[PDB]
Amino acid sequence: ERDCRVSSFRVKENFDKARFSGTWYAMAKKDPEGLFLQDNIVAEFSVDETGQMSATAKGRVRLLNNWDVCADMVGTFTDTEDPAKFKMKYWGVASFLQKGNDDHWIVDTDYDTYAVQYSCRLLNLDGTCADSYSFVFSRDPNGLPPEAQKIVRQRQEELCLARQYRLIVHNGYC
Ligand SMILES: CCCCCCCCCCCCCCCC(=O)O
Ligand SMILES: [Cl-]
């Protein structure tokens, strides 16, 4: 019944870059193929005088054969016609860390409590996503309040992802 076409997904109306700035803690993540960020994931968003948004991120990533490593990542966002949909160019401070360019959608936020992020890296031929990821962020590293949690689960469902998230732990690893 429900529409899982990416073109159908609602995003944050009149998204406000300035209100979104600051520290966000990742509480949950839906992983893409070849996942990168594992846990202890903390993002820092900024915006400059030109209205350009950027971010940094810290997190554990496990390179294969079980090598752990606290990644330090950088992101810069190019605006689109939709104030909540961006193109994110990202890279690591270390050259060998993953780089690329993903869609970056702010699906919902209230700025001071919760945020839901979404990226489809590759579409199916029917408009659904073939390879997606999503972060749920909290301003409080101890988690969301119940009201926010309930809103977020709804958004997760609307993205057709609700069954596919895992919790992100924060234990000072970085
Ligand atoms: C959306 C994450 C926070 C955005 C902050 C950008 C900092 C670099 C972003 C790195 C993108 C790589 C994370 C997607 C890959 C993954 O986690 O599986
Ligand atoms: Cl579920």
Determine the atom of ligand 1 nearest the C-alpha atom of 119. Answer: 1
The answer for residues whose C-beta is within 8 angstroms of residue 144's C-beta and 6 or more apart is 27, 113, 114, 136, 138, 152
Please, what is the Cα angle at 26 between 91 and 21, to 5 degrees?
Answer: 70
What residue type is assigned to position 166 of the chain?
A: R
The answer to the question of whether 98 is labelled as a binding residue is yes
What was the structure determination method?
A: X-ray
Q: CA-to-CA distance for 133 and 30, rounded, in angstroms?
A: 5
| Model resolution, angstroms | 2.0
Residue among 40, 70, 90 whose CB has most ligand 1 atoms within 8 A, to mutate? 90
Q: What is the CATH number assigned to the segment(s) 1-174? A: 2.40.128.20
Backbone angles phi, psi at 157, to 5 degrees: -65, -40
For residue 34, the ligand 1 atom closest to its alpha carbon is 18
Ligand 2 centroid – CA 163 distance (Å): 4
How many angstroms does the Cα of residue 81 sit away from the middle of ligand 2?
33
Q: Which helix (H) or strand (E) holds 154?
A: helix 146-158
Name the residue at shortest CA distance from atom 3 of ligand 1: 43
Sort strands 85-92 and 67-79 into parallel, antiparallel or unpaired.
Answer: antiparallel
**Relative to the alpha carbon of 41, which ligand is closest?**
1
Query: Sign (positive/negative) of CA torsion 131, 137, 142, 144?
Result: negative
Can you read off the two tokens belonging to residue 145? Answer: 């309040």
Residue of 4, 1, 11 lying closest to 126 (CA atoms): 4
Domain map (residue ranges) of the chain: 1-174
